[PDB]
Structure 1
Amino acid sequence: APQQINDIVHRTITPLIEQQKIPGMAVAVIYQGKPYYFTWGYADIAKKQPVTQQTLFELGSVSKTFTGVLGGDAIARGEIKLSDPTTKYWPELTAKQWNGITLLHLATYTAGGLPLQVPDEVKSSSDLLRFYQNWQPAWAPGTQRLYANSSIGLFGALAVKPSGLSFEQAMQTRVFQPLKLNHTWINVPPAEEKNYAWGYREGKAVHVSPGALDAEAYGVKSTIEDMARWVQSNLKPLDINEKTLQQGIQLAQSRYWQTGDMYQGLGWEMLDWPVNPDSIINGSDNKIALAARPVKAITPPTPAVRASWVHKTGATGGFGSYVAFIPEKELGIVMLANKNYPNPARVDAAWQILNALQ
């Protein structure tokens, strides 16, 4: 890379790895639209396997950006509308509390208090129905935001029903393949297991366990190269040839709700750029097990704003990921690690790098 990029990346990330005791890390910087890659450490400590540009990391909740864009693409196809009632796509959801809860509300965590996690005891599909039928909202729809896998997870599941494709097949054919993300997976194939990093939690090697709505909320695994391509695609969507996918990306970066300085997209979250680094560093949270926030509706939503800090954090038990980009500056970063280390340290490092290059 240009020496400036080399130096800011290394001077930020070396100390981060030391301080956080991260076994392995990969970083991509997108600068003037071109990617530059960096790797450190171990994908598998026991087997002494290094992190490489081909190593697969669990994205955790960064997966929600894929779900939001896949939903955006279904909207663009005319298959679904965000104003549609949830019950249009799950007619068995007859319980009256669902009256008035739209796909928008599911996608944006504003349904009225759907919980962070789908319970482990929810195995079967009938368990899933029972779970949602019995859930009682604390709040009216469109009034408070509570970040929730059970919310965006169900959005993803419903969004693909008109297509008749499984969520995985829809994601593959409509998002991964067109964008040439050929090493991005909901289920890691045997061919790629050699490249699948272990996550580390309390020193133990761990991979994400199966759960209801996992694919839709937290289940993608990817390489630093594919994630750089993901950022490039999101930086310049109107350069994507597939018309519905281009529109879906723009829909996912549109601003639907505001809480403080932050705006809620479909998967993506956004702040106006230039951002106050304290507004995103400290705002990256999560350490807080549950933070319920009143939201202001943006009526109608603001189409994707170029002058934004667009970002998403993600974790699993053994991994911590972060993506941020600024369309206006054709600048972005991806940080993938096989330890779940504090969000504020992620955002701080990302800020330092992008601020230096801006």
Structure 2
Amino acid sequence: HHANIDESKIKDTVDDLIQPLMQKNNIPGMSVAVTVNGKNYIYNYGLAAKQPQQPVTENTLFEVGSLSKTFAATLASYAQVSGKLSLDQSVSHYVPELRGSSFDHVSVLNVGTHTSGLQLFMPEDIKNTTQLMAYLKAWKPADAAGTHRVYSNIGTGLLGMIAAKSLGVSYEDAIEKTLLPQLGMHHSYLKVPADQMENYAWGYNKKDEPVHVNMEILGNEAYGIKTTSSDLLRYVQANMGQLKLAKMQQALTATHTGYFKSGEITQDLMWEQLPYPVSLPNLLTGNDMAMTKSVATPIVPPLPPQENVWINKTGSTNGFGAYIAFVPAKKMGIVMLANKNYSIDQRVTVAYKILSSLEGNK
């Protein structure tokens, strides 16, 4: 602790919110990463595993659940800026087995914005590509694609699958061999390697059992990433153009294009945003859209990537709870990782309090 140092003030702000949060929710371990003024701060708390006990360190890997959807979008955006994908084309244009199905009328943009109408969860009985394609050929949305927003793991799966195919590789290769390496995210994985298993935190479910996420079909696209807070802070900085990584920077920025309004949010390519300065009530409402259908209204022409917005994404698994938010105009961002799935309203509120503390009022 030092005087006249913003770092000590930030640590106090973060500690004072995170310690009670972890106590009352019984969260075993967290890492919080903050960037502001071009400086990066990483704060680690508690335990990556209870038995045998292992502390959270700079190397601890957390499951981030739906933060993974933003990587599928970044890959699709990379394919798009590389000339391999048009977001306005239909899904069946790129997946010829689906020609003649309802996917003749669902665009890639629809699956990238949760506006196809596909339901939230993949049917549990779908285990292989044959069963998946049979389901998709038989599926019909309740409303015309493009009229409603239904947050969807399945649609995100299609987005990433199409993006990878357009690049000539599997999704796993696209992410681990192309995207994460080009972003400099060397401790981010869909499959944690043997030399990193000691760093892979256990998640603690509602009954406090240690669990790791089970990876099923198209799951890598929707929920597969394990990563460190430092790697995600780099991802946040890259999303704010702060790093010397040109196609990749274009791809990152273009994911922030605003395509639909729904409720309080602007739906980008997987990322979600609200105008900044943003009120806590609207941010909370905008982060309570995970399981219900809402009306979606197109933004056409699309809203270009903005500076004056709060861009964010939640992610969870049975054992983990994560959140990212950043405001490009202020070059400030936060990553909050936990090995217990605690409520989104608390993640958002803590992040709002932290970011609001980072400069004076004017």
Q: Give the TM-score normalised by structure 1.
A: 0.96
1:221-241 deviations in Å (ceiling 9; x for gaps): 00111011111111116x554
Q: Does residue 272 of the first structure (1) align with residue 282 of the second (2)?
A: no
Root mean square deviation of aligned Cα? 1.3
Aligned to 1:68: 73
Q: Which piece of structure 1 moves more, 91-100 or 252-261?
A: 91-100
Q: Do the aligned residues in 2 keep the contact of 1:120 with 1:211 (CA within 8 Å)? A: no
1:10-49 deviations in Å (ceiling 9; x for gaps): 1111111112110110000111122100011111101110
Q: Which of residues 240, 255, 259 in structure 1 aligns to 2:258?
A: 255
Q: Percent identity?
A: 39
Q: Does residue 119 of the first structure (1) align with residue 123 of the second (2)?
A: yes
Say which SS state the counterpart of residue 73 (structure 1) adopts: helix
Code of the residue aligned with 2:28 in structure 1: it is: P
Aligned to 2:146: 142
- Paired with 1:314 and 1:209, the residues of 2 have a C-alpha distance of 15
Say which SS state the counterpart of residue 126 (structure 1) adopts: helix
**CA apart distance, 1:183:** 0.3
- Paired with 2:235 and 2:334, the residues of 1 have a C-alpha distance of 11
- Paired with 2:233 and 2:248, the residues of 1 have a C-alpha distance of 17
Say which SS state the counterpart of residue 52 (structure 1) adopts: coil
Q: Do the aligned residues in 1 keep the contact of 2:147 with 2:297 (CA within 8 Å)? A: yes
**CA apart distance, 1:67:** 1.0
Q: Which of residues 80, 105, 113 in structure 2 aligns to 1:100?
A: 105
Code of the residue aligned with 1:200 in structure 2: it is: Y
Q: Which of residues 53, 56, 68 in structure 2 aligns to 1:48?
A: 53
Say which SS state the counterpart of residue 357 (structure 2) adopts: helix
**CA apart distance, 1:126:** 0.3
Alignment of 1:191-340 (within 5 A): 191-201=195-205, 202-236=207-241, 239-241=243-245, 243-285=246-288, 290-340=291-341
Aligned to 2:3: none
Q: Do the aligned residues in 1 keep the contact of 2:263 with 2:294 (CA within 8 Å)? A: no
- Paired with 1:240 and 1:295, the residues of 2 have a C-alpha distance of 36
Code of the residue aligned with 1:206 in structure 2: it is: V
- Paired with 2:105 and 2:98, the residues of 1 have a C-alpha distance of 12
1:234-264 deviations in Å (ceiling 9; x for gaps): 1116x554x2211111111110001132111
Q: Do the aligned residues in 2 keep the contact of 1:29 with 1:331 (CA within 8 Å)? A: yes
Q: Do the aligned residues in 2 keep the contact of 1:24 with 1:338 (CA within 8 Å)? A: yes
Q: Give the TM-score normalised by structure 2.
A: 0.95
Q: Do the aligned residues in 2 keep the contact of 1:254 with 1:303 (CA within 8 Å)? A: yes
Code of the residue aligned with 1:101 in structure 2: it is: V
- Paired with 2:285 and 2:111, the residues of 1 have a C-alpha distance of 26
Consecutive unaligned residues in structure 1, runs of 5 or more: none
Q: Do the aligned residues in 2 keep the contact of 1:108 with 1:265 (CA within 8 Å)? A: yes
Say which SS state the counterpart of residue 155 (structure 2) adopts: helix
Alignment: residue pair count? 353
Q: Do the aligned residues in 2 keep the contact of 1:259 with 1:296 (CA within 8 Å)? A: yes
Q: Do the aligned residues in 2 keep the contact of 1:174 with 1:245 (CA within 8 Å)? A: no
Aligned to 2:96: 91
Aligned to 2:10: 5
Code of the residue aligned with 1:50 in structure 2: it is: P
- Paired with 1:39 and 1:203, the residues of 2 have a C-alpha distance of 21
**CA apart distance, 1:283:** 3.1
